[PDB]
């Protein structure tokens with residue numbers, strides 16, 4: 001399992017945890033040096049357990065799906081909470097089994113629904129190590145709308161961080177001060193599937209993408225990725241979603 005403590009968590013320690021998270025996700029193949037995630041895994045082996053501890057030591061165990069690095073549910077106290085979705089429901093059969101009670105959050109684990117439930121778009125939610133510390137705390141005492149928001153933060157500071165080197169930096173800078181994500185950051189999160197598929201379809205088309213993916217760079221304006229030489233590919237995206245799960 002991979003663990004992380006916000007107590008005296010400078011940009012380095014975090015960087016190390018994100019490395020551990022990446023190294024925990026198994027793969028067999030590599031598409032252009034970028035680890036290609038397995039198309040499936042059966043049983044308990046399909047789940048990764050993160051032990052996050054807040055500045056005060058309070059913890060929670062989050063379950064991750066190693067074929068796509070999706071948050072399935074978590075364990076606070078003796079309770080486990082799972083998103084309201086099939087994969088999560090399947091996950092419960094293997095994780096947090098000695099949990100006294102299991103609760104199913106009234107929402108699904110995708111960004112859109114999580115935003116509707118919390119009442120604010122990701123653009124208006126400050127992320128960072130302090131907010132991660134808040135999120136770990138908010139999750140300790142049940143509150144569906146408080147959790148929807150704390151989950152938007154938890155997902156972006158771990159899952160998305162591991163996926164894009166860029167997003168790991170955005171968080172390390174906000175290690176002592178939160179701030180809403182950069183438009184560059186959102187476009188990336190909204191492209192994990194697109195990029196992954198295209199980087200894979202390029203293998204056999206001369207590193208060329210069958211179709212372009214637009215982004216924002218960070219400068220603040222439109223960008224278009226046309227092939228595997230681009231900065232995003234060569235030095236950003238760290239994990240590729242197996243086209244099979246698409």
Ligand SMILES: *[C@@H]1O[C@H](CO)[C@@H](O[C@@H]2O[C@H](CO)[C@@H](O[C@@H]3O[C@H](CO)[C@@H](O)[C@H](O)[C@@H]3O[C@@H]3OC[C@@H](O)[C@H](O)[C@H]3O)[C@H](O)[C@H]2NC(C)=O)[C@H](O)[C@H]1NC(C)=O
Nearest residue numbers: 206207208209212224225226227228229230231232233234
């Ligand atoms: C493969 O991906 C690369 C990027 O990873 C792309 O190739 C070339 O990228 C430049 C980027 O600007 C495209 O844009 C214009 O290209 C012409 C010809 O090279 C320039 O005269 C234009 O100014 C402009 O690019 C210049 O590059 C220097 C920078 O200061 C500015 O961006 C600009 O001045 C090129 O058109 C593109 N090459 C071709 C043949 O289209 C491209 O996405 C893709 N192409 C291939 C063949 O793999």
